[PDB]
Amino acid sequence: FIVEDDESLGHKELKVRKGHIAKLMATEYQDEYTWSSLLN
């Protein structure tokens, strides 16, 4: 998991957020993200 040191919200944070993993959940229960489509 990548991390940017700087942050407008402050201290330090990993870049990925709740919305991305929500989209992953949606694509899994679709039954258009992939692992590669998160990599790009």
Partner: peptide
């Protein structure tokens, strides 16, 4: 505390169905 001994998934799916 709740301490999370067990978890749920499709309920949170439906929560995001209402969130989106």
């Amino acid at each position: 505390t709740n301490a999370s001994p067990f978890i749920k998934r499709d309920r949170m799916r439906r929560n995001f169905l209402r969130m989106r």
